[PDB]
Homo-oligomer: 67 residues x 6
């Protein structure tokens, strides 16, 4: 459990591993998708796998707002 | 359109203006909220106000995963 | 057409595809080069290729200022 | 030198100070402008003021592409 | 349990509040200091104050290398 | 030499090269580790290698604070 303001729970629906990074796609409430690129080491350490229930976290200063 | 893979449509449910930045809270589908800190100039340009329909845009490399 | 304050129009002069990401190099006005690392999926979806006229976009909070 | 691939020399054409941050607008070559939100402490350390010659530094993973 | 590979424990040695954000300086092990600009909301939720033990969390793609 | 507020000197203890990016792990004072993902081009241009003494740099707005 953490205090971060932006926490979106979802289910992993896609995982593509590279050499240094990995792309994780999560389906969140309503069904919308969140895509994350993290280190491959983290995928392994956190045991990220298709179907896993995980949470996407984003610092507020990284959220752009467009029309 | 734009390369950022996370484009979440939502409505403004919170707005706090500073002098250089502003904090905007959007309610997206499924009831999740996402908070953004952006420049006050962008707030003015988009006419951000309570109820406005806007899009939160996040690069995949800015999304962390919490297990 | 977007409202983002930082928009730099340029021509793709370099493209290197990885497994998860891709590196895109744009020559902007005057000749300055801008390098972007985006997801490979975006390269494909946006149809990014050598010679294409595209625009680089950057959130203001990601711009460091040095001497 | 530094790893950030985007190092854009420019002159300060806009400056707005907050208490924690500041907004700095640089005019780079070819007439493009780039806006940055940085800590007020950095503004003071660099002596940021209108006309100052500074460098905007952006990591490639923070550059989005708009097609 | 979070993917960000940089998790640096430290104590608060500086705190400056704005209206939307706050600047927090943490002294980590070995005497290094790290400065963060975060939302004022987070400062209040974590009870940030001088001496507080907190963790600075940084995504690997946000770390530049200077040679 | 640069003015950036966050500069953490360290020794490269890990290096993994991908096609577009590379993962650099630095042991900083106290012995703790900082992980950076930069472009492969930069590794080559800066001559980054195991054992090298380098400095990690982070913009303050990219530093999240957690309990
Ligand atoms: Cl895979
Ligand atoms: Cl993206
Ligand atoms: Cl911004
Ligand atoms: Cl290629
Ligand atoms: Cl870079
Ligand atoms: Cl900053
Ligand atoms: Cl990371
Ligand atoms: Cl924040
Ligand atoms: Cl290697
Ligand atoms: Mg980033
Ligand atoms: Mg950022």
């Amino acid at each position: 459990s953490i205090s971060a303001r932006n926490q979106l729970k979802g289910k992993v629906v896609g995982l593509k591993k590279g050499v240094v990074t990995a792309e994780v796609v999560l389906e969140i409430a309503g069904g919308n998708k969140i895509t994350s690129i993290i280190s491959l080491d983290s995928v392994e350490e956190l045991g990220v796998k298709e179907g896993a229930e995980l949470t996407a976290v984003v610092k507020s200063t990284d959220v752009m707002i467009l029309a």
